[PDB]
Amino acid sequence: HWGYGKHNGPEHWHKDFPIAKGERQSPVDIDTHTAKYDPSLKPLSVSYDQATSLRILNNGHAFNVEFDDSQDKAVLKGGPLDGTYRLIQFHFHWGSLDGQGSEHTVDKKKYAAELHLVHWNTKYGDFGKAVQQPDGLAVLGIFLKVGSAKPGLQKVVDVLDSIKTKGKSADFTNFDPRGLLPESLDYWTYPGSLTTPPLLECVTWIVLKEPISVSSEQVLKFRKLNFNGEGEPEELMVDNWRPAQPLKNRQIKASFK
Ligand SMILES: NS(=O)(=O)c1ccc(NC(=S)N[C@H]2CCN(c3cccc([N+](=O)[O-])n3)C2)cc1
Ligand SMILES: [Zn+2]
C-alpha cells in the first residue's frame, strides 16, 4: 500500500523495500560543479521513428504510455550504454505547484515535472529479467518547466480526462515520443535505481540538461488526475515524486564540456 500520501510516502517505503536505503538509489541531486565531463562518452542515439504506442494507463501512481516492445522498434543506444535498450513506456512525475515535481534536481533546483522514458536491455530477453541486472534498464529523464506549450504533449493532455482514476486505460496508438525531446541531447549519467518500489538497482540514468517547456494549462490537466479508483474519495494525483537520495560512492558524468 505504498504511495505519496501523508502515511505511505517515500519516508515509509524502506519498511516493505529495505533497498530504499541502498548504495545506488535514485533520484539524486546533480551538482553541476562536481559532475565531470567525460570525453569518452558517446552521443546518445535515440531511434524513435518506428515507435508503436499502444495504450495509456492510470496505474494509481502516474499514467504510463505503453509501447509495443515485442521487437526492436524504438531503441536507445550509445552514450554510456553497451548494446540495445527497447522503449517499453514513458510516464511523468509532477508537483501540486510549479516550484516542485521533478525527482532529479540540478544544484538543488526542482523542476515542475520530469519525464521518464523507460528502456530495457535486449541482452536479457524480457523486462522482468532485465530489472534483476545492474545494467538491465536505461531511463532517459527530461525536465519540464512551465512556459510556452509543448505541441507534442497535447495529444497526451487531451486523453487524461478519459483515464481520471486508477485502473482506467484508453487506446493510445500512433503517438510519436520524438515530440517530447528538447533540441539538445547533452546529458548527465550515473548508475541508480527505479524511483518507485520495488526500487531495484538496475538503472543507467541519462538525464538531459535542457528542459522542455510546457504550458500552465498542460500541467494543470496532469494535476486533475486521481490516485484513487472510480467512486472512491477523490485524491488529486499531485506530488508523485521521490526526493533526492544520497549519492554515496557514485560519480555523475557529463557528456558536455
Ligand atoms: N520512475 S522510474 O523511471 O525509475 C521507473 C519506475 C517503475 C518502472 N516500472 C516498470 S517499466 N515496470 C514494468 C513491469 C512490467 N511493465 C510492463 C510490461 C509490459 C507491458 C506493459 N504495459 O503495461 O504495457 N508494462 C512495466 C520503471 C521505471
Ligand atoms: Zn519515473
Checking phi first, is residue 123 left (phi over 0); if not, alpha (psi -120 to 50) or beta? alpha
| Cα 97 to chain centroid, rounded | 19
Q: Which among 154, 155, 150 has a CA at the least distance from the CA of 170?
A: 155
In eight-state DSSP terms, residue 4 is: S
Query: CA-CA distance, 104 to 109, in Å (whole number)?
Result: 9
Q: Return the SS3 of 20.
A: helix
Check pocket membership of 194 for ligand 1, CB cut-off 6 A: yes
Contacts of 40 (CB under 8 A, 6+ apart): none
State the DSSP code for 70: S
Contacting residues for 192 by C-beta, under 8 A, at least 6 apart: 24, 25, 26, 27, 28, 201, 203, 205, 250
Q: How far is the CA of 96 from the centre of ligand 2 (A)?
A: 17
Provide the 8-state DSSP code for 128.
H
* CB-CB neighbours of 52 under 10 Å: 16
Catalytic residue numbers read: 61
Q: How many CB atoms lie within 10 A of CB 220?
A: 11
Among candidates 42, 39, 40, 47, which has minimal Cα distance to 84? 47
Whether 195 is in the pocket of ligand 1, judged by its Cβ within 6 Å, is yes
Experimental method: X-ray
CA 38/CA 154 separation, integer angstroms: 36
Resolution of the determined structure in angstroms stands at 1.5
Atom of ligand 1 nearest to the CA of 116: 3
Q: Which helix (H) or strand (E) holds 218?
A: helix 216-222
Domain 1-257: CATH architecture, name and number where available = Roll (3.10)
Nearest ligand, measured from the Cα of 58: 1
In angstroms, the CA 3 to CA 229 distance is 14
Residues 6+ apart with CB under 8 A from 158: none
For 80, the 3-state DSSP assignment is coil
Q: Is the peptide bond before 27 cis (omega within 30 degrees of 0)?
A: yes
Q: Is 131 in the pocket of ligand 1 (CB under 6 A)?
A: no
Longest dimension (CA), the chain: 54
Where along the chain do its domains lie? 1-257
Please count the CA atoms within 13 angstroms of the CA of 54 that sit on its side-chain side. 10
